[PDB]
Amino acid sequence: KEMPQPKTFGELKNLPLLNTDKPVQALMKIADELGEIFKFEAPGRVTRYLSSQRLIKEACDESRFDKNLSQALKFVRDFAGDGLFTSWTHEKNWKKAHNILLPSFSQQAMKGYHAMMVDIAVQLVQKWERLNADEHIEVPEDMTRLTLDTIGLCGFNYRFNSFYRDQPHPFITSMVRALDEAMNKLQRANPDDPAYDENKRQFQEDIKVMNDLVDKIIADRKASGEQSDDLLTHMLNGKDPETGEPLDDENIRYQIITFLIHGHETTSGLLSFALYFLVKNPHVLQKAAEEAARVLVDPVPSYKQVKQLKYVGMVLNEALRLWPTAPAFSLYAKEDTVLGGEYPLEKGDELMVLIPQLHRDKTIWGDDVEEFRPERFENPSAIPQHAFKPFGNGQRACIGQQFALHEATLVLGMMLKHFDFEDHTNYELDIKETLTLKPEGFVVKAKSKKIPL
Numbered sequence: 300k301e302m303p304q305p306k307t308f309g310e311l312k313n314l315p316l317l318n319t320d321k322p323v324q325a326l327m328k329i330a331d332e333l334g335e336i337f338k339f340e341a342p343g344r345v346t347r348y349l350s351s352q353r354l355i356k357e358a359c360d361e362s363r364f365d366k367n368l369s370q371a372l373k374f375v376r377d378f379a380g381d382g383l384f385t386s387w388t389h390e391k392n393w394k395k396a397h398n399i400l401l402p403s404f405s406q407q408a409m410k411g412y413h414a415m416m417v418d419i420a421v422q423l424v425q426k427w428e429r430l431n432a433d434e435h436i437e438v439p440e441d442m443t444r445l446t447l448d449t450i451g452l453c454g455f456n457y458r459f460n461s462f463y464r465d466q467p468h469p470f471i472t473s474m475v476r477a478l479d480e481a482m483n484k485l486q487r488a489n490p491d492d493p494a495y496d497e498n499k500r501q502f503q504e505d506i507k508v509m510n511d512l513v514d515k516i517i518a519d520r521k522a523s524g525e526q527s528d529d530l531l532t533h534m535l536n537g538k539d540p541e542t543g544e545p546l547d548d549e550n551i552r553y554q555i556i557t558f559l560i561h562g563h564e565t566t567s568g569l570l571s572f573a574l575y576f577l578v579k580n581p582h583v584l585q586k587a588a589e590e591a592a593r594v595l596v597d598p599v600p601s602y603k604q605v606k607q608l609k610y611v612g613m614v615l616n617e618a619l620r621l622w623p624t625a626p627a628f629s630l631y632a633k634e635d636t637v638l639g640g641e642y643p644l645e646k647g648d649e650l651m652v653l654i655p656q657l658h659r660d661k662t663i664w665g666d667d668v669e670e671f672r673p674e675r676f677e678n679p680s681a682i683p684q685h686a687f688k689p690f691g692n693g694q695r696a697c698i699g700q701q702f703a704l705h706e707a708t709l710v711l712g713m714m715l716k717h718f719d720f721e722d723h724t725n726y727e728l729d730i731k732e733t734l735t736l737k738p739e740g741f742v743v744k745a746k747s748k749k750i751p752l
């Protein structure tokens with residue numbers, strides 16, 4: 300079987316097709332025309348984009364395929380190092396950090412982080428309670444303040460105090476700029492061009508700003524001896540079951556930077572898309588609000604009450620179905636293998652899972668794939684294996700899944716309890732693509748139900 304492939308441009312191959320600010324959406328369009336698999340070549344590289352549950356379930360076989368570091372991840376590694384997200388599975392530090400961190404990220408472990416999550420969530424709610432009549436909310440902007448501050452506090456007991464500032468903490472400014480630079484290098488035709496000397500200089504400065512803060516906090520903690528309810532305390536005290544070794548200080552720093560750079564943007568996007576879909580679907584919003592009011596009966600949510608927000612959970616899963624905020628992951632063939640009984644692959648061949656397209660597979664989800672219908676997830680164990688993959692696959696899946704969902708469910712629950720929301724501009728969905736996805740420029744008005752915290 301010959302494999303479909305979009306337009307080529309001479310020696311540049313398919314590369315010009317991704318000369319756009321929205322490449323994932325462009326690839327979804329190509330997938331719409333070419334089907335479940337297409338080859339994509341650039342000067343000196345080749346990948347194949349998968350879109351069907353049929354082929355993705357095979358790609359998800361860990362005996363056959365392992366996580367690949369995409370070019371995007373190789374650039375992010377310049378500041379995320381050998382943290383979990385940017386490591387090869389066979390690097391010693393991957394398995395070691397994975398073993399140590401798994402217990403710190405369990406559903407049970409979320410009880411320990413809940414109070415800090417509530418701290419920041421209350422700050423968001425109070426911010427919105429305190430807006431004057433003529434004001435509005437910049438949704439992704441505020442969700443980003445929320446998620447960064449939450450990961451800072453739960454991550455290493457540090458307050459960025461984002462809700463006290465117009466200009467973010469310097470660490471945050473550097474982080475966002477470093478992420479942007481790693482992204483720009485993907486579409487940069489002539490990297491050695493002197494017009495990029497300043498970018499390179501700035502990138503090194505921003506890496507230093509991030510390293511200096513995190514290294515200082517780690518050093519301060521070891522000198523103080525203080526024990527906290529945070530990830531840092533877990534990483535300082537944890538020992539690998541296999542070797543009995545703890546993580547060294549540099550790797551701990553990379554883990555912290557990783558939780559921030561990856562966790563903040565994905566979770567902020569999710570909350571933003573969820574609110575977007577709620578305001579665009581009033582009947583669904585009514586059902587979510589009814590549950591929030593019924594369940595969240597105390598001045599602040601308890602850990603247990605968050606799990607009881609069953610419909611809110613479904614709303615978030617349905618937002619992740621339509622716009623999974625980390626929209627792709629990359630795999631390599633471990634050995635020569637045949638995919639789908641039709642496509643021969645050689646050892647090391649690279650595959651890309653196009654998640655938003657997977658989540659629109661009509662053979663799994665039915666015809667109404669574009670409809671926002673949380674009720675799809677009423678019985679979540681009834682959805683076929685490998686049909687729904689917003690958190691990636693297997694041992695290389697999101698270690699932060701329970702953290703992200705606890706945070707998102709808590710915060711969306713509180714928003715729904717405390718406010719009526721208005722799509723005051725009839726916002727037109729504009730999805731900005733970076734390492735992640737977000738609804739750019741999404742704004743609302745929130746009218747308080749005047750319920751005290």
Ligand code: HEM
Nearest residue numbers: 383384558562565566569625628690691695697698699703
């Ligand atoms: C809704 C929000 C989130 C989504 C959609 C998401 C999605 C993903 C995906 C798709 C991967 C696999 C990437 C790949 O295969 O290349 C991943 C990995 C990872 N995530 Fe998340 N993530 C979210 C939130 C978080 C948070 C809040 C944290 C930490 C506080 C986190 C920490 C990590 C780590 C450490 C990895 C690498 C795990 C490993 O390979 O051992 N994520 N995530």
